[PDB]
């Protein structure tokens, strides 16, 4: 037997997942400004489009990184704190930012 795929699609899956609760959960609800909630909403399109397969895998282990305490407590976004929301979106930008100057 071997593993080495079928984790590799789940560590994507749970990645579009944790993607997709940010777009459809937490972002129209969050209390921030359109302009904010634009950058957001942009953001988390990008995201999506790059985690919706396997072929560069590098790319998405910042993002597996990002929500590793997602994960480990299997927990999603929109069941945490606004606080907590607000750190994930806002590091989601920071790292797209730099991402796109390094």
């Given at each position: 037997?071997?593993?080495?795929?079928?984790?590799?699609?789940?560590?994507?899956?749970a990645?579009?997942?944790?993607?997709?609760?940010?777009?459809?959960?937490?972002?129209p609800?969050?209390?921030?400004?359109?302009?904010?909630?634009?950058?957001?909403?942009?953001?988390?399109?990008?995201?999506?489009?790059?985690?919706?397969?396997?072929?560069?895998?590098?790319?998405?282990?910042?993002?597996?990184?990002?929500?590793?305490?997602?994960?480990?407590?299997?927990?999603?976004?929109?069941?945490?704190?606004?606080?907590?929301?607000?750190?994930?979106?806002?590091?989601?930008?920071?790292?797209?930012?730099?991402?796109?100057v390094?």
């Amino acid at each position: 037997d071997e593993y080495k795929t079928n984790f590799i699609d789940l560590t994507r899956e749970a990645l579009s997942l944790i993607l997709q609760d940010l777009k459809n959960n937490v972002i129209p609800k969050i209390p921030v400004g359109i302009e904010k909630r634009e950058r957001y909403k942009n953001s988390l399109r990008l995201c999506l489009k790059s985690a919706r397969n396997t072929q560069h895998m590098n790319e998405l282990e910042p993002y597996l990184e990002l929500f590793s305490e997602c994960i480990k407590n299997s927990k999603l976004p929109s069941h945490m704190s606004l606080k907590d929301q607000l750190f994930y979106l806002d590091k989601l930008l920071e790292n797209l930012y730099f991402q796109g100057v390094e």
